[PDB]
């Protein structure tokens, strides 16, 4: 339909870190929540690529903070997995579902636990992350952490479980 | 397995 090309230009600009182009395209009515071939919205791609300024612009111009792509990822899943703490916090401040499950039952806490970033685990726990969530294999974040040598996280997750 | 999640990459993706 009309505007589809603006949405594709916006998706590219958010993926590529083109701050000014994003602003131009929004001022021209581009669909902030258009999605690409795998269901990524601009907010997904900005969070995936670590583009904090664009994440912020997209949120203020109406991005769906809890949009899901074809794998069930939300922007928060991608920001956690790729170690963008400020984006994780901004996303949560704007209503990101901290316990969002992708199509395999993986939550952001699972991801932070597996990757091994203690501060990400603490942030998510502080915002109500579910220590008891089980993915499609019955694994909790604890299971992922301990299975990946992230002992300090496993212990923090254990104490939270009590 | 391995590989971080991404647009076309599930968390559980084969070996």
Numbering used by the authors:
A (entry chain A): 9 to 170
B (entry chain B): 1 to 15
From the paper:
The V3 loop of the HIV-1 envelope (Env) protein elicits a vigorous, but largely non-neutralizing antibody response directed to the V3-crown, whereas rare broadly neutralizing antibodies (bnAbs) target the V3-base. Challenging this view, we present V3-crown directed broadly neutralizing Designed Ankyrin Repeat Proteins (bnDs) matching the breadth of V3-base bnAbs. While most bnAbs target prefusion Env, V3-crown bnDs bind open Env conformations triggered by CD4 engagement. BnDs achieve breadth by focusing on highly conserved residues that are accessible in two distinct V3 conformations, one of which resembles CCR5-bound V3.
In order to define V3-crown epitopes that lead to broad neutralization, we co-crystallized bnDs with V3-IF (BG505), i.e., the V3-crown mimetic that all bnDs bound best. Since bnD.1 and bnD.3 also target the V3 post-CD4 engagement, the conformation adopted by V3 in complex with these DARPins must either be a transitory intermediate state that occurs prior to CCR5 binding or an induced fit upon binding an intermediate. This conformation will hereinafter be referred to as Inter-CCR5-V3. In contrast, the Inter-CCR5-V3 conformation was sampled less often in the MD simulations, suggesting that bnD.1 and bnD.3 must have the means to efficiently interact with V3 prior to the adoption of this V3 state. Despite different preferences for the Inter- or Post-CCR5-V3 conformation, the bnDs overlapped in their contact patterns, engaging mainly with R/H308, I309, P313, F317, and Y318. The R308 side chain engages via a salt bridge with bnD.1 and bnD.2. Overall, we observed that bnD.3 forms eight H-bonds, distributed across six V3 amino acid residues, thus potentially leading to the comparatively high binding affinity observed for this DARPin. Six of these bonds were established with the V3-crown peptide backbone, and as a result, this should make bnD.3 less sensitive to V3 sequence variations. These features probably contribute collectively to the observed higher neutralization breadth of bnD.3 compared to bnD.1, which covers a BSA similar to bnD.3, but only forms four H-bonds with V3. The bnD.3/bnD.1/3074 epitope is exposed to the outside of the trimer with mAb 3074 approaching the trimer from the top similar to DH753. Collectively, this suggests that bnD.1 epitopes are arranged such that a bivalent engagement across the trimer is not possible, and that the bnD.2 epitopes are not accessible for the larger sized bnD.2-Fc in its current design.
